[PDB]
Design an enzyme around this catalytic site. Structure first.
Site, PDB file in Angstrom:
ATOM      1  N   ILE A  38      -5.383   0.107  -2.318  1.00 33.09           N
ATOM      2  CA  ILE A  38      -4.025  -0.439  -2.148  1.00 33.09           C
ATOM      3  C   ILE A  38      -3.724  -0.657  -0.663  1.00 33.09           C
ATOM      4  O   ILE A  38      -3.375  -1.767  -0.258  1.00 33.09           O
ATOM      5  CB  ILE A  38      -2.964   0.462  -2.851  1.00 33.09           C
ATOM      6  CG1 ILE A  38      -2.730  -0.004  -4.295  1.00 33.09           C
ATOM      7  CG2 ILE A  38      -1.604   0.437  -2.147  1.00 33.09           C
ATOM      8  CD1 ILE A  38      -3.973  -0.174  -5.141  1.00 33.09           C
ATOM      9  N   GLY A  50      -5.654   7.508   6.704  1.00 34.80           N
ATOM     10  CA  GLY A  50      -6.754   7.313   5.757  1.00 34.80           C
ATOM     11  C   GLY A  50      -6.491   6.120   4.850  1.00 34.80           C
ATOM     12  O   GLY A  50      -6.103   5.053   5.329  1.00 34.80           O
ATOM     13  N   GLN A  51      -6.688   6.310   3.544  1.00 35.07           N
ATOM     14  CA  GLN A  51      -6.511   5.253   2.541  1.00 35.07           C
ATOM     15  C   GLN A  51      -5.602   5.720   1.402  1.00 35.07           C
ATOM     16  O   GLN A  51      -5.389   6.922   1.222  1.00 35.07           O
ATOM     17  CB  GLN A  51      -7.873   4.843   1.974  1.00 35.07           C
ATOM     18  CG  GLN A  51      -8.818   4.209   2.990  1.00 35.07           C
ATOM     19  CD  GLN A  51     -10.249   4.080   2.483  1.00 35.07           C
ATOM     20  OE1 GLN A  51     -10.824   2.994   2.485  1.00 35.07           O
ATOM     21  NE2 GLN A  51     -10.832   5.193   2.053  1.00 35.07           N
ATOM     22  N   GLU A  57       3.398   9.344  -7.607  1.00 33.47           N
ATOM     23  CA  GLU A  57       3.682   8.474  -8.754  1.00 33.47           C
ATOM     24  C   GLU A  57       3.413   7.022  -8.368  1.00 33.47           C
ATOM     25  O   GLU A  57       3.612   6.639  -7.211  1.00 33.47           O
ATOM     26  CB  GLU A  57       5.126   8.654  -9.247  1.00 33.47           C
ATOM     27  CG  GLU A  57       6.209   8.065  -8.348  1.00 33.47           C
ATOM     28  CD  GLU A  57       7.609   8.488  -8.751  1.00 33.47           C
ATOM     29  OE1 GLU A  57       7.859   8.698  -9.959  1.00 33.47           O
ATOM     30  OE2 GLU A  57       8.466   8.603  -7.851  1.00 33.47           O
ATOM     31  N   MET A  58       2.965   6.221  -9.334  1.00 37.59           N
ATOM     32  CA  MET A  58       2.574   4.832  -9.065  1.00 37.59           C
ATOM     33  C   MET A  58       3.821   3.946  -9.042  1.00 37.59           C
ATOM     34  O   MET A  58       4.697   4.071  -9.905  1.00 37.59           O
ATOM     35  CB  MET A  58       1.574   4.311 -10.112  1.00 37.59           C
ATOM     36  CG  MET A  58       0.387   3.530  -9.550  1.00 37.59           C
ATOM     37  SD  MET A  58       0.783   2.374  -8.223  1.00 37.59           S
ATOM     38  CE  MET A  58      -0.828   1.704  -7.845  1.00 37.59           C
ATOM     39  N   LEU A  59       3.876   3.045  -8.060  1.00 35.74           N
ATOM     40  CA  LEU A  59       5.060   2.231  -7.789  1.00 35.74           C
ATOM     41  C   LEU A  59       4.714   0.756  -7.635  1.00 35.74           C
ATOM     42  O   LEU A  59       3.542   0.379  -7.606  1.00 35.74           O
ATOM     43  CB  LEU A  59       5.745   2.743  -6.522  1.00 35.74           C
ATOM     44  CG  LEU A  59       6.232   4.194  -6.608  1.00 35.74           C
ATOM     45  CD1 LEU A  59       6.392   4.805  -5.226  1.00 35.74           C
ATOM     46  CD2 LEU A  59       7.526   4.274  -7.413  1.00 35.74           C
ATOM     47  N   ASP A  80      10.629   6.917  10.627  1.00 33.21           N
ATOM     48  CA  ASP A  80       9.808   5.699  10.560  1.00 33.21           C
ATOM     49  C   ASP A  80      10.258   4.789   9.410  1.00 33.21           C
ATOM     50  O   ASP A  80       9.430   4.224   8.688  1.00 33.21           O
ATOM     51  CB  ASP A  80       8.320   6.073  10.414  1.00 33.21           C
ATOM     52  CG  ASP A  80       7.386   4.873  10.514  1.00 33.21           C
ATOM     53  OD1 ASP A  80       7.583   4.023  11.406  1.00 33.21           O
ATOM     54  OD2 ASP A  80       6.446   4.785   9.694  1.00 33.21           O
TER      55      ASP A  80
HETATM   56  C1  LIG Z   1      -0.190   0.705   5.994  1.00 27.24           C
HETATM   57  C2  LIG Z   1       0.138   2.088   5.423  1.00 27.24           C
HETATM   58  C3  LIG Z   1       0.515   2.254   3.943  1.00 27.24           C
HETATM   59  O1  LIG Z   1       0.554   1.273   3.196  1.00 27.24           O
HETATM   60  N1  LIG Z   1       0.780   3.531   3.579  1.00 27.24           N
HETATM   61  C4  LIG Z   1       1.117   3.832   2.315  1.00 27.24           C
HETATM   62  C5  LIG Z   1       0.265   3.553   1.243  1.00 27.24           C
HETATM   63  C6  LIG Z   1       0.631   3.899  -0.059  1.00 27.24           C
HETATM   64  C7  LIG Z   1       1.859   4.521  -0.320  1.00 27.24           C
HETATM   65  C8  LIG Z   1       2.254   4.896  -1.614  1.00 27.24           C
HETATM   66  O2  LIG Z   1       2.541   6.074  -1.837  1.00 27.24           O
HETATM   67  C9  LIG Z   1       2.328   3.970  -2.594  1.00 27.24           C
HETATM   68  S1  LIG Z   1       2.052   2.345  -2.464  1.00 27.24           S
HETATM   69  C10 LIG Z   1       2.347   1.995  -4.047  1.00 27.24           C
HETATM   70  N2  LIG Z   1       2.300   0.797  -4.654  1.00 27.24           N
HETATM   71  C11 LIG Z   1       2.062  -0.312  -3.933  1.00 27.24           C
HETATM   72  C12 LIG Z   1       2.894  -0.734  -2.890  1.00 27.24           C
HETATM   73  C13 LIG Z   1       2.595  -1.900  -2.186  1.00 27.24           C
HETATM   74  C14 LIG Z   1       1.472  -2.664  -2.523  1.00 27.24           C
HETATM   75  N3  LIG Z   1       1.199  -3.787  -1.831  1.00 27.24           N
HETATM   76  C15 LIG Z   1       0.975  -3.674  -0.352  1.00 27.24           C
HETATM   77  C16 LIG Z   1       0.280  -4.877   0.246  1.00 27.24           C
HETATM   78  N4  LIG Z   1       0.661  -6.122  -0.472  1.00 27.24           N
HETATM   79  C17 LIG Z   1       0.083  -7.339   0.159  1.00 27.24           C
HETATM   80  C18 LIG Z   1       0.253  -6.079  -1.883  1.00 27.24           C
HETATM   81  C19 LIG Z   1       1.197  -5.093  -2.542  1.00 27.24           C
HETATM   82  C20 LIG Z   1       0.642  -2.246  -3.570  1.00 27.24           C
HETATM   83  C21 LIG Z   1       0.943  -1.077  -4.277  1.00 27.24           C
HETATM   84  O3  LIG Z   1       0.170  -0.630  -5.310  1.00 27.24           O
HETATM   85  C22 LIG Z   1       0.115  -1.561  -6.404  1.00 27.24           C
HETATM   86  N5  LIG Z   1       2.656   3.134  -4.673  1.00 27.24           N
HETATM   87  C23 LIG Z   1       2.648   4.224  -3.878  1.00 27.24           C
HETATM   88  N6  LIG Z   1       2.943   5.410  -4.409  1.00 27.24           N
HETATM   89  C24 LIG Z   1       2.699   4.816   0.759  1.00 27.24           C
HETATM   90  C25 LIG Z   1       2.330   4.475   2.064  1.00 27.24           C
END
Ligand SMILES: CCC(=O)Nc1ccc(C(=O)c2sc(Nc3ccc(N4CCN(C)CC4)cc3OC)nc2N)cc1
EC number: 2.7.11.23
Length: 342
Positions: A32, A38-39, A106-108, A154
């Protein structure tokens, strides 16, 4: 050649592989995001039977210790029983896997920058922006809980995510640069666009820096563009000044970094150093928001809930969030009782 028996790469990140099963539980699907920490990976949890976002910390002492501080704050936020904690991302659990600390969230859905990118940076409605403003103020009220006193430090569109793509529910993410209130260790903090004048001026700071950030973010959600898009700290401050005017003298007299941006003239008043910018306080928020011109760029003309009355309530709320003094700057409790939310 080999790093962590081939599980890591040359810069300490775990090699993400699609279809890999971790501990006979987490089914990894796709990468993602990748940050300095990290990742973060999308994975399906087989006992809970639901998708999760696994934050895979780098195999490094510096990034591990920082993620342990994040874990401590997340778990300390989980301890409180209240309902307003659900506007922060739930840290479900954590574990160690092949020398990497892994935080299970949790997935978002997408982030708010992706929402703005879908608008072609033209913004979302005042109706939707009110819904995020209320939930973000509720989140900041939770963070202001005396036993927590957490400064996110932030806040930006990337660090706010949508719960579901259809529902309008938002949650604050990434507490990696977060610490609880206290004595000052760090001065260079926050993302520049959303960085507070007290942080720019080298002054003391507290929970109020997140409200300044919110103020900036909420204008950007409705306009589509960043409010103060500085290419450096000097340019940042000049863009803040052209909207809000010169910071008050009593602040600038105390400020250790006042002489980076401003200059005390022989008469005792403060003024900008030479460097393009409009005179101080001339690019009014009234005109940026389009209170009387049908919203930003005339795009909300004749749309429901975008009256002169509704824009003045929003302008007033934003100006309180963007108060120069962090002591009189509006707090989450009073913000939630603003007429913009009636
Ligand atoms: C650059 C640092 C960064 O992204 N940090 C980060 C990474 C992941 C999360 C996090 O906890 C996330 S991110 C996420 N979903 C999510 C949010 C944005 C995206 N993106 C981000 C990039 N975009 C071009 C495509 C959509 C994808 C995701 O998963 C399908 N769910 C959670 N729980 C929080 C912070």
């Amino acid at each position: 050649k080999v790093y962590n028996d081939g599980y890591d790469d040359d810069n300490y990140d775990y090699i993400v592989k699609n279809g890999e099963k971790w501990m006979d539980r987490y089914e990894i699907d796709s990468l993602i995001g990748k940050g300095s920490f990290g990742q973060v990976v999308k994975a399906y949890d087989r006992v809970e039977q639901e998708w999760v976002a696994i934050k895979i910390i780098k195999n490094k002492k510096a990034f591990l210790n920082q993620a342990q501080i994040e874990v401590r704050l997340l778990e300390l936020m989980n301890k409180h029983d209240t309902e307003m904690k659900y506007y922060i991302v739930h840290l479900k659990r954590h574990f160690m896997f092949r020398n990497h600390l892994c935080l299970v969230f949790e997935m978002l859905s997408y982030n708010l920058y992706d929402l703005l990118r879908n608008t072609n940076f033209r913004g979302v409605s005042l109706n939707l922006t009110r819904k995020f403003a209320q939930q973000m103020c509720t989140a900041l009220l939770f963070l202001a809980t005396p036993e927590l006193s957490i400064i996110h430090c932030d806040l930006k569109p990337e660090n706010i995510l949508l719960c579901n793509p259809k529902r309008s529910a938002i949650k604050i993410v990434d507490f990696g640069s977060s610490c609880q209130l206290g004595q000052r260790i760090y001065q260079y903090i926050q993302s520049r666009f959303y960085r507070s004048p007290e942080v720019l001026l080298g002054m003391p700071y507290d929970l109020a820096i997140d409200m300044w950030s919110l103020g900036c973010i909420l204008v950007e959600m409705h306009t589509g563009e960043p409010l103060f898009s500085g290419a450096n700290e000097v340019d940042q401050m000049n863009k803040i000044v052209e909207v809000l005017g010169i910071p008050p003298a009593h602040i600038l007299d105390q400020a250790p970094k006042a002489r980076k941006f401003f200059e005390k003239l022989p008469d005792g008043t403060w003024n900008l150093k030479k460097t393009e910018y409009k005179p101080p306080g001339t690019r009014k928020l009234h005109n940026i928001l389009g209170v009387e011109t049908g919203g930003p760029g005339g795009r909300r003309a004749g749309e429901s809930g975008h009256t002169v009355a509704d824009y003045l309530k929003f302008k007033d709320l934003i100006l309180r969030m963007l108060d120069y003094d962090p002591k009189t700057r509006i707090q989450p409790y009073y913000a939630l009782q603003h007429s913009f939310f009636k």
